[PDB]
Design a protein around this ligand. Structure first.
Ligand code: K
Ligand code: K
Ligand code: K
Ligand code: K
Ligand code: K
Ligand code: K
Ligand code: K
Ligand code: MG
Ligand code: MG
Ligand code: MG
Ligand code: MG
Ligand code: MG
Ligand code: MG
Ligand code: MG
Ligand code: MG
Ligand code: MG
Ligand code: MG
Ligand code: MG
Ligand code: MG
Ligand code: MG
Ligand code: MG
Lengths: 257, 35, 66, 101, 64, 59, 92, 237, 300
RNA sequence: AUAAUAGUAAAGAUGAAAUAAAUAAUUAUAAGACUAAUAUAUGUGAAAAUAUUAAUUAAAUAUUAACUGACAUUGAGGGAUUAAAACUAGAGUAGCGAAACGGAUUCGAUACCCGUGUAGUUCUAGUAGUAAACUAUGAAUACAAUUAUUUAUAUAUAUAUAUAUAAAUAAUAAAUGAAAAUGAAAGUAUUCCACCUGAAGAGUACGUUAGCAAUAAUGAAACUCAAAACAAUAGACGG
């Protein structure tokens, strides 16, 4: 059985929500309700099978290449992504419930701001945030996820997913919406991706992708509607990126010590 | 059916009802009902 | 399998099911508790306890037990 | 050559499910090894419940349990029960004495 | 072989006794499946922890 | 094909067995021993099949 | 219903002469075909050219080809290993 | 094998060694075994009830308990031959455990042969943790399968909502079909929706089968050719 | 109690099966329950059976008959391949349809006696559906029934003279009708084969409802294309259709007009090549087989 | 075996040989004996025995119902049946085959092999009551731990299996045993009968009884000796 993880300072979260982003009702929808909804569906889908003993991140990797397990993949991807989003927007990862700590001033580290300049042609963090808000509004028509990811070449770049798209495995990033029209450049990217997946010799037709997320923003209606409303998702993404917990985001960047 | 059977090759039910005044006490009963 | 029954074990059997004999776990628990107390006693007394098992795969359990 | 002996190719029936192993030589050999006349029971009068002794005047049925020369087949070959083998052999011997077999 | 040597040497023995196994050959039989590694390792684990508690109680009485 | 008929009706064996007379007791002994060897071979093949099946499954 | 025949206890379980599949030599079959080809179309007939070319290559270095002409049966090893387990003997 | 005596009396044989002086030092196990005596009866024990179905073992129905006529129309006035045979053996033979659910399980998989193709894991997690409310078929912790139907049927007959087992079984079967149809659609739609957002898959199930069949059909091609050439040479003879 | 727990154990959940593990006849559906073990348990030869499975086994799927035997082995085969046949059918997205247009067996429909007008056809099917019954147990259906039916003589000797006396005095053509109905009316309360073992619908192969369209980035899919293999190079003898091997099922392939020339060229090795097919329809027969009809889509 | 037919010059036998219009082939006729497969003597029968077919007569199984109310077990003496050989009469006599006479083999060959082949082997009516007539194991009853495999009866059903209770056979626990082994007895017990008391002499002598007869039953002692026998062990040896 997959159970909803306990969050630090949960009593505060159920009373005052997440300050500057979500209210108490908004956080109950995104985490206490939706995370319960996802975990229960995952348990029903995976109970009695070998996947029941694996964590959601491992389930999505195991099932990423199986077309008829997409339902399990979607549930595992959503569960992992939601706790990636709830973790970097959380007031404090440490449990100051008995310490009553009200001073958590987290700021981008030097390694993060050095990789931002290197990967974005000298752009500042503030400018990159504006590009992230723009990318979300023009690339994610409906539900999806906004990620700041790091690849095998030490370069930070921006990835957007439609519905439950994993950042780890490029064949399942779901960054192109094929319901609408696509340019020849987008079709080239899809055609090149298909060729890479066909070069793999494995009988499971799986490739190696070492991309890892650094920041996760939930773009689903379960996270913003109640507090911002239809059409105000760009005001929601702005608040999230301005109130990130950088103790978690800094720890996601590999240092090598 | 027993006594009230239509088979050409009947069983002992028919012969028993005859000697027991049943095939006759039912024929009259049916006819009396028809009356 | 009931075909391989050593009838000297009759008193431990709970019944037969699907062509095998089902061991009475109520007795297994009582015997296990008694055996466990003996191991605890010998260990607490400083005795040498040897764990013998020669079926494939048992080594890991045997090594940690020792 | 565009031809293969029937003994070297398996013809998968229609409506049946198959595995990749069904195209191998192991399947061919396995089908030969486990090839028994198990469908005889449904076509074997003497394995149905009839009394073989009622067929003593029907040489055509009895001739299915004798060799080309008229030698009664051993129970190992007929697969009958002891009683039916015993009754069938009596029927054949009686049929021979009457002048029909 | 080991069981008979234990008898000859007056060494008490514990063993898992399956339905085809002779109970009287051991001092303390444990009726149970001896063919599954899970069943064996479950019973062995319980006996091993029981020994550990005895060892910890002996090392504790020495300290105090 | 003709030779196969002879062997499946035991014609050559019967002809040879009819050359000399054998006492009824000796005939009965030979019939008993032959049946035992036939049945013994069937039991042997059954055990070899179990061996091969057990070997295939890794026993 | 098919009669099972159970053996008595035996001192051993062994096949006297285990059967082995001896694959036919590729060079010998090539020679057997060429010889037949000459029997029908005639000796040195242009129809058997390919046969002659193949035979020469098969036999160029070794007249019977370079083959792993070694095969042994293991039935007796397994039969002796598993007999005590599978014979169904009653307990002592 | 004979009931052994020397394995359970190690304490008494050791005590004779110590009392005589043949063994100078008390063994470490000696005190432990003395406090925890071995069981040494090794007896066969009778049993008077089948634990599975509660059937009583060892009860003889006397003729006084059968006053009415039987199915043949005859009264029973004397014990029959079976009643006069001692039945001690039945007291000692391990009872055959039976369950009504076993009959339904065989029925379910005879009616739905392809449910067998859904892999089942026999390895248990913890039987003691199962907190199931069989008012509904779905349960957190276990898959939806034939057993879900059987347990639902038993709950219906146990709550007396239905009287006949067949009616309860049919009711459970339809609940099972509804849940199976919702899952077959969630999987089809999830695949369709993913492809519409640019999901790519290396090998499909159909493709996996084709590749495996090719590997087998390639070895089969070689052997066929080889065995169609040995025949030609052997037949030439 | 231990007995209660045992009845609900995972081993108890598997229905007793002694069907041959090595069957060489015609296979139409799964015969054995596939058992699966997780990778962690496989590393320890643990499958939840009585004994450890030999380490030689690398598959995670098996089928078994007996937990233990007199030969001190488990009777099992390390295969689980009927699951891939079902999943490949699911990938072909062809719903199973009734060629007779019968009601959907998976829906609780309100049926009426339209087909119950054959009361004499099926009431006697109980004694006449004895194709493979013993010569004396089937004969026990003659005396055992005769007594049961003969116990209702008084009831039918009064009802018939009280509800249809004219027929008893005119003709038995209608009396026979009242007899067939009487027994059925007095048998519906009874339980004769109250449990029906016949396969219900698809048998679990597919729970897909017909009607749904397959959306794709290139538009709605109108024809399903599936790779396959032609088994024979000559149409099935006596049949106007060849045989193909598509997704673990043997289908009947109908060609547009002509047979591609690769047939004659390849010959008996035609199965060595993969062709593209279109699955027209899929039906289910009473034997529990799937009647898949295909069409050899050829590049044009 | 005889006859016919065409057709021939060798045939037959053996380790190799030799002794006594054919052999082979196709027809026709006659005679006696025997009973291929199935088949396991499975089974049946007191044993001896019993397997080509049919018929008549006699006997034989399981369960249930009713009935009798210990009427049972065993069985000295006695009675009956009893393979093959043998005998007394009358038939039969193909094949086989003591003996006899021949042919070979051999140093010799009163043998083994070959030929001619009488009694006998067959039937009917009798005599006789003997066999390694053996499971070398008297009959009956109560009882004791398992498995496998068949068979039988019964029960159930979601109809073909499943569940029961007996019998048989196989392998065993325990037990017993000099051991080999026995295994439901060669175990645990009870009841009745037969029989044994070192080897050899001897199943002989004498007598008696029975039989047409051969013989069968019953059945010793003296003298002499310290032997004699069984199971198992390790060797040696084996055409
Ligand atoms: K006999
Ligand atoms: K009295
Ligand atoms: K008396
Ligand atoms: K007497
Ligand atoms: K004569
Ligand atoms: K004898
Ligand atoms: K006696
Ligand atoms: Mg075991
Ligand atoms: Mg002549
Ligand atoms: Mg005969
Ligand atoms: Mg016998
Ligand atoms: Mg007497
Ligand atoms: Mg005379
Ligand atoms: Mg002579
Ligand atoms: Mg006389
Ligand atoms: Mg004499
Ligand atoms: Mg005598
Ligand atoms: Mg005799
Ligand atoms: Mg008597
Ligand atoms: Mg005398
Ligand atoms: Mg001796």
């Amino acid at each position: 059985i997959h159970v909803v993880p306990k969050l630090p300072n949960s009593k505060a979260l159920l009373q005052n929500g997440v300050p500057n982003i979500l209210s108490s009702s908004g956080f109950k929808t995104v985490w206490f309700d939706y995370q319960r909804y996802l975990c229960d569906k995952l348990t029903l889908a995976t109970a009695g099978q070998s996947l029941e003993s694996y964590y959601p991140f491992h389930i999505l990797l195991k099932t990423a290449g199986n077309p008829l397990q997409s339902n399990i993949f979607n549930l595992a991807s959503s569960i992992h992504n939601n706790h990636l989003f709830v973790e970097n927007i959380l007031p404090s990862a440490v449990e100051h419930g008995t310490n009553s700590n009200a001073v958590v001033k987290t700021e981008p580290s030097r390694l993060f701001l050095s990789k931002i300049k290197d990967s974005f042609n000298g752009s500042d963090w503030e400018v990159v945030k504006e590009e992230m808000i723009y990318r979300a509004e023009n690339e994610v028509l409906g539900q999806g996820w906004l990620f700041l990811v790091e690849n095998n070449e030490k370069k930070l770049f921006i990835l957007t997913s439609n519905n439950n798209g994993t950042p780890y495995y490029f064949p399942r990033n779901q960054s192109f919406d094929l319901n609408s029209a696509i340019s020849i450049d987008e079709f080239a990217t899809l055609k090149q991706m298909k060729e890479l997946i066909g070069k793999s010799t494995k009988l499971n037709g799986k490739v190696q992708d070492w991309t890892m997320p650094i920041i996760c923003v939930n773009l689903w209606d379960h996270a913003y509607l109640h507090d911002y409303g239809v059409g105000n998702r760009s005001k929601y993404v702005k608040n999230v990126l301005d109130n990130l917990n950088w103790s978690v985001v800094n720890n996601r960047i590999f240092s090598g010590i | 059916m027993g006594s009230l059977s239509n088979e050409k090759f009947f069983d002992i039910s028919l012969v028993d009802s005859y000697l027991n005044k049943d095939l006759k006490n039912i024929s009259n009963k049916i006819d009396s009902k028809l009356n | 399998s009931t075909s391989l029954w050593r009838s000297s074990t009759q008193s431990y059997i709970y019944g037969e099911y699907k062509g095998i004999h089902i061991i009475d776990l109520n007795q297994t628990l009582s015997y296990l508790k008694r055996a466990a107390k003996v191991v605890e006693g010998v260990s607490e007394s400083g005795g040498i306890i040897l764990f013998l098992g020669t079926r494939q795969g048992q080594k890991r359990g045997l090594e940690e037990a020792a | 050559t565009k031809k293969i002996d029937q003994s070297l190719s398996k013809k998968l029936p229609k409506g049946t499910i198959y595995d990749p192993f069904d195209f191998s030589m192991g399947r061919i050999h396995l089908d030969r090894k486990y090839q028994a006349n198990k469908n005889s029971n449904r076509n074997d009068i003497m394995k149905s419940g009839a009394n073989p002794l009622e067929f003593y005047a029907r040489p055509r049925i009895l001739s299915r349990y004798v060799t080309s020369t008229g030698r009664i087949q051993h129970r190992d070959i007929t697969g009958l029960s002891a009683k039916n083998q015993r009754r069938l052999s009596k029927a054949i011997r009686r049929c021979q004495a009457i002048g029909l077999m | 072989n080991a069981l008979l040597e234990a008898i000859k040497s007056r060494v008490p023995t514990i063993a898992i006794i399956d339905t085809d196994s002779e109970p009287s050959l051991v001092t303390y039989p444990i009726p149970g499946n001896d063919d599954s590694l899970r069943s064996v390792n479950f019973l062995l684990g319980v006996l091993a922890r029981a020994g550990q508690r005895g060892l910890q109680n002996r090392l504790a009485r020495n300290n105090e | 094909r003709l030779n196969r008929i002879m062997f499946e009706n035991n014609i050559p064996g019967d002809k040879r067995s009819q050359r000399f007379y054998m006492k009824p007791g000796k005939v009965a002994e030979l019939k008993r021993s032959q049946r035992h060897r036939k049945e013994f071979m069937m039991g042997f093949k059954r055990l070899i099949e179990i061996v091969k099946d057990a070997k295939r499954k890794g026993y | 219903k098919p009669p099972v025949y159970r053996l008595p206890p035996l001192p051993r379980l062994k096949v006297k002469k285990p059967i082995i599949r001896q694959e036919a030599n590729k060079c010998l079959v090539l020679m057997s075909n060429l010889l037949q080809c000459w029997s029908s179309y005639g000796h040195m007939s242009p129809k058997c050219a390919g046969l002659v070319t193949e035979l020469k290559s098969c036999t160029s270095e070794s007249a019977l080809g370079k083959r792993n002409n070694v095969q042994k049966s293991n039935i007796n090893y397994h039969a002796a290993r598993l007999y005590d387990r599978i014979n169904g003997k009653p307990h002592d | 094998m004979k009931i052994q005596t020397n394995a359970v009396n190690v304490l008494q044989r050791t005590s004779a060694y110590l009392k005589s002086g043949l063994l100078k030092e008390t063994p470490a196990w000696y005190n432990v075994v003395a406090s925890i005596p071995p069981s040494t009866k090794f007896t066969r024990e009778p049993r008077f009830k089948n634990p599975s179905n509660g059937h009583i073992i060892g009860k003889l129905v006397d003729v006084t308990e059968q006053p009415h006529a039987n199915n043949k129309g005859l009264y029973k006035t004397r014990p029959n031959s079976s009643d006069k045979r001692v039945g001690v053996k039945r007291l000692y033979r391990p009872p055959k455990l039976t369950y009504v659910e076993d009959r339904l399980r065989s029925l379910f998989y005879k009616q739905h042969p392809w449910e067998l193709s859904r892999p089942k894991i026999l390895v248990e997690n913890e039987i003691g943790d199962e907190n199931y409310d069989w008012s509904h078929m779905l349960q957190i912790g276990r898959p939806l399968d034939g057993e879900s139907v059987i347990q639902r049927t038993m709950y219906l007959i146990k709550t007396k909502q239905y009287g006949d087992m067949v009616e309860a079984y049919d009711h459970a079967r339809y609940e099972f079909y509804a849940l199976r149809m919702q899952e077959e659609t969630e999987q089809q739609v999830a695949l369709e929706e993913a492809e519409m957002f640019g999901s790519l898959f290396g090998v499909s199930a159909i493709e996996h089968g084709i590749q495996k069949e090719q590997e087998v059909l390639d070895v089969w091609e070689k052997k066929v050719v080889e065995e169609t050439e040995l025949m030609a040479a052997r037949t030439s003879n | 109690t231990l007995a209660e727990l045992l009845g609900r154990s995972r081993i108890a959940q598997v229905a007793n099966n002694h069907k041959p593990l090595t069957y060489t006849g015609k296979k139409f559906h799964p015969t054995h329950q596939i058992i699966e073990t997780k990778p962690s348990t496989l590393y320890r030869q643990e499958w939840g059976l009585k004994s450890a499975i030999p380490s030689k086994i690398k598959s995670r799927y098996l089928v078994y008959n007996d937990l233990d035997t007199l030969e001190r082995i488990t009777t099992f085969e390390p295969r689980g391949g009927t699951q891939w046949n079902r999943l490949r059918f699911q990938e072909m997205g062809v719903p199973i349809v009734s060629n007779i247009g019968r009601q959907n067996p998976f829906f609780k429909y309100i049926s009426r006696p339209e087909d119950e007008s054959h009361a004499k056809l099926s009431l006697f099917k109980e004694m006449k559906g004895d194709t493979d019954i013993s010569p004396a147990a089937m004969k026990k259906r003659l005396k055992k029934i005769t007594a049961l039916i003969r116990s209702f003589q008084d009831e039918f000797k009064e009802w018939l003279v009280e509800n249809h006396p004219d027929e008893l005095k005119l003709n038995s053509n209608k009396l026979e009708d009242y007899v067939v109905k009487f027994l059925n009316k007095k048998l519906e309360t009874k339980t004769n084969k109250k449990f029906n073992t016949e396969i219900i619908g698809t048998g679990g192969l597919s729970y897909s409802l017909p009607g749904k369209l397959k959306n794709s980035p290139n538009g709605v899919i109108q024809r399903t294309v599936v790779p396959g293999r032609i088994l024979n190079v000559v149409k099935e003898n006596n049949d106007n259709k060849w045989l193909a091997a598509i997704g673990g099922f043997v289908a009947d392939v109908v060609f547009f007009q002509s047979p591609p020339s690769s047939f004659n060229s390849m010959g008996d090795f035609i199965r060595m090549k993969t062709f593209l097919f279109e699955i027209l329809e899929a039906s289910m027969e009473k034997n529990g087989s799937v009647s898949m009809h295909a069409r050899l889509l050829e590049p044009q």
